[PDB]
């Protein structure tokens, strides 16, 4: 019933998402756990101010899809949990999309993106949870459409949160 267009957790870290700026900002992290590779897109520049960190997906061919469903699983760390810890810290990030008939390739083009929503965690990671070695995984879902162009990008803007994306699943529904 759900036809998967993009699946970050399963994609072995090979999608070539684009980050702006450079390599300061969002960072692709890899480890192996339970003899299964594991990917997190992470950023935590909570100390220095004026953070504007963008992450853009590969281009997704829409095909039959007219309404898409974007499921995210992420962690967000408590702004008071930083020994030191700045007044530039935030606990949300922004989700955007862009439709086009054309690949952008490598010029990022934030100006063509439309804001879907502010994404806020139900479960904030606190210093206690590091002690228990247990993960508070937020699950949030948004919907966009109708889509009418050949393809689309998702993008993520961080403005100074300590965020990890574990899962980004994009699908449409066929009945």
């Amino acid at each position: 019933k759900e036809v998967v267009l993009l699946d970050f957790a399963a994609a072995g870290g090979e999608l070539g998402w684009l980050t702006h700026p450079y390599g300061k900002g969002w960072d692709l992290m890899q480890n192996i756990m339970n003899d299964m590779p594991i990917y997190m897109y992470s950023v935590c520049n909570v100390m220095s101010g004026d953070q504007d960190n963008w992450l853009r997906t590969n281009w997704v061919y829409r095909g039959e899809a007219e309404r898409i469903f974007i499921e995210l699983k992420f962690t967000v760390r408590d702004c008071n949990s930083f020994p030191g810890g700045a007044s530039s810290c935030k606990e949300t990030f922004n989700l955007y999309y862009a439709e086009s008939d054309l690949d952008y390739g490598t010029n990022f083009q934030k100006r063509l993106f439309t804001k879907i929503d502010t994404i806020a965690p139900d479960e904030i990671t606190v210093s206690s949870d590091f002690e228990a070695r247990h993960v508070k995984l937020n699950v949030e879902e948004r919907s966009v459409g109708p889509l009418t162009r050949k393809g689309f990008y998702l993008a993520f803007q961080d403005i100074g949160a300590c965020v990890a994306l574990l899962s980004v699943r994009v699908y449409y529904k066929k009945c």
Binding site: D27, L28, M29, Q30, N31, I32, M33, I38, M40, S42, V43, C44, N45, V46, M47, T75, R77, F82, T125, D129, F130, A132, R133, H134, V135, K136, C162, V163, A164
Partner: peptide, 18 residues
């Protein structure tokens, strides 16, 4: 260099690369 803080407890498991 990236000396930034640990995003979540998954980071306690060694071998992470960036």
């Amino acid at each position: 260099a990236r000396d930034c803080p640990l995003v979540n407890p998954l980071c306690l498991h060694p071998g992470w690369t960036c």
